[PDB]
Design a protein around this ligand. Structure first.
Ligand SMILES: Nc1ncnc2c1ncn2[C@@H]1O[C@H](COP(=O)(O)OP(=O)(O)O)[C@@H](O)[C@H]1O
Ligand SMILES: Nc1ncnc2c1ncn2[C@@H]1O[C@H](COP(=O)(O)OP(=O)(O)O)[C@@H](O)[C@H]1O
Ligand SMILES: O=c1[nH]cnc2c1ncn2[C@@H]1O[C@H](CO)[C@@H](O)[C@H]1O
Ligand SMILES: O=c1[nH]cnc2c1ncn2[C@@H]1O[C@H](CO)[C@@H](O)[C@H]1O
Ligand code: NA
Ligand code: NA
Lengths: 319, 319
């Protein structure tokens, strides 16, 4: 199974139907003033671990979320996990605490500015990744800082390869702590903005970062993604979205596809392309977990976009 | 009395303790990803008319709000208006509708990105500014579009001089409609970003705009403001804030001071400086209407900042 470490949260998403880029005037003292009409607020199921596990589960993988929720309002999420067949073994529900809540303001370029009220996420380190059974692969996503660092150290000690996904948690890291996490990581997955921040904080170039992981994956929104590995760099195309509704959690849907590909021995071109497709399926719906394709629908859309069906290598090499 | 036309709304404000400028990377496909920790959400009394009338009332002016609220949840605001002595004569409460709600995400530079659920504001044109009695001065602030345009036409027809304050409503205007509003206006008050947008949409330069009003007032945050009038341009200093907590509604506190100054025949240097002080008093507190100085406290802080007490001209000229 695949351990998915990160936030579990309720999201309130406000989508600007436009591009903040067109509205920023750097020469002015106020560089952006923008008001846009929204409908009634609706809470969505989110959190980085929730979203990544949701995607992995859609593909038929065995996603084991490791995160904390608050007993006061955890129930709808616990019931949703049960209804989808997601194990709650490592979902700790903390007494007399509220679950993480994100107020996400975003545009169609996925420029997210989020006011985050962390609640139970603050105690994410109560879970010990090293103790989780039957894990062959993991991801460490945005979470409480102490919990993020502990998950990287425990997984490395346990010899569980992991994708490091610092995401919205990046500001919590200093250079030494970020360098250390990358040393421990087997793969890193970031978007292009997060990648620049990682280079800046570590003081390492992308070349130096790539030298310390099996793959450096950098997503670029509607431009697709790049996967740098030992023998080359894959240029992964985007899949054309049926419609562009809400990019929140595109990266998480993508990470669900990448984890599935890695577990099943996909080559990077096909793991990347499956990931890229998950992100395009997700963007056509509002909220990070509203899209709900069957595995047969995923495979058909993959073959339409790319010309072949996605699955793991059948080469029986010596390794 | 002074008619204050604009939105009346409940605000939910998320303040980033920092500057979005430092986090925008224009070279990347994602130019900003930022998550910041917030405390529990608290609803505040807002809306542009609410805030401007609140400021005018603090100074001892006679503020008459003209706006629409929704009967479903208007009550706390109606009770607040009663407790502060703000007349509700032109506050229309619409049946089976909800009041405007703003989810404002902002930084310490007052870069506001707002998700606005307008509710009853959509029907602001049910009020007729031309019908309001005993009005010597008005402001037309951000509101429902139809209501904004109607208020400018009715006030002009009634010969009531007004400050045009398009603010967050600016995107609703086209060039012809914006040019027309400026022709009708006696003064315009914008921040520096809104000013650039006004020049862009009308296709007029600041010189051309100034030729069509008695004063063009442009606010510049911590840099103070400029007031361009027939005989010159005042450089209005900022007042150093006691602390910088929340800039939301600084411009509205400033407009309350300007309206007071205009009604009482302040010179532009002193009207500007009173306005500038109102904005500095407001920024030291969270929410647009939380600051509550007495008039004696306002006068003392004015004299500390500027070296004299603020009041209207005592020159009895021929006019
Ligand atoms: N507008 C779009 N059209 C199609 N696919 C998209 C679009 N935006 C994102 N995706 C898919 O989702 C992936 C991740 O999106 P991205 O915005 O880079 O991640 P994040 O959510 O981490 O910021 C992209 O690499 C792409 O494959
Ligand atoms: N950081 C600050 N320190 C002191 N005064 C401020 C500050 N920011 C705003 N003000 C006062 O409030 C006025 C209006 O603020 P501004 O940010 O320009 O308006 P708006 O709310 O319309 O964007 C300024 O001209 C200044 O006088
Ligand atoms: O600062 C944060 N820490 C952890 N999780 C977060 C943060 N900000 C937003 N999200 C979560 O990120 C998901 C999209 O990838 C959203 O579902 C939101 O819950
Ligand atoms: O698009 C809008 N139209 C009208 N009013 C608005 C809009 N966006 C925000 N506010 C109001 O602006 C005030 C700060 O000046 C806030 O109190 C908010 O209620
Ligand atoms: Na490594
Ligand atoms: Na005019």
């Amino acid at each position: 199974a695949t351990l998915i470490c990160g936030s579990i949260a309720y999201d309130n998403i406000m989508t600007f139907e436009g591009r903040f880029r067109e509205h920023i005037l750097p020469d002015q003292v106020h560089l952006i003033n923008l008001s846009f009409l929204v409908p009634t607020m609706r809470r969505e199921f989110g959190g980085c671990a929730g979203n990544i596990a949701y995607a992995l589960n859609l593909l038929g993988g065995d996603a084991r979320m490791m995160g904390t929720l608050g007993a006061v309002d955890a129930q709808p999420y616990l019931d949703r996990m049960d209804a989808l067949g997601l194990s709650r073994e490592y979902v700790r529900v903390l007494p007399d605490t509220y679950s993480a809540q994100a107020m996400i303001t975003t545009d169609l370029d996925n420029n997210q500015i989020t006011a985050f009220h962390p609640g139970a996420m603050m105690q994410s380190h109560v879970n010990h990744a090293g103790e989780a059974k039957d894990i062959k692969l993991a991801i460490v996503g945005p979470d409480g800082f102490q919990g993020m660092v502990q998950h990287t150290e425990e997984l490395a000690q346990a010899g569980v390869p992991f994708i490091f996904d610092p995401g919205q948690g990046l500001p919590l890291f200093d250079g030494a702590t970020l360098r250390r996490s990358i040393e421990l990581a087997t793969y890193i997955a970031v978007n292009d903005y997060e990648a620049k921040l990682v280079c800046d904080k570590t003081g390492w170039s992308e070349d130096e970062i790539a030298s310390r992981v099996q793959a450096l994956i950098i997503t670029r929104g509607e431009h697709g993604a790049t996967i740098r590995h030992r023998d080359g760099t894959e240029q992964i195309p985007a899949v054309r979205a049926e419609r562009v509704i809400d990019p929140t959690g595109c990266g998480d849907a993508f990470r669900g596809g990448l984890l599935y590909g890695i577990e099943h021995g996909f080559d990077w071109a096909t793991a990347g392309r499956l990931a890229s497709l998950m992100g395009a399926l997700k963007i056509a719906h509002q909220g990070p977990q509203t899209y709900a394709p069957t595995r047969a629908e995923i495979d058909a859309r993959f073959e339409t976009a790319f010309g072949y069906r996605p699955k793991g290598s059948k080469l029986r090499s010596l390794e």
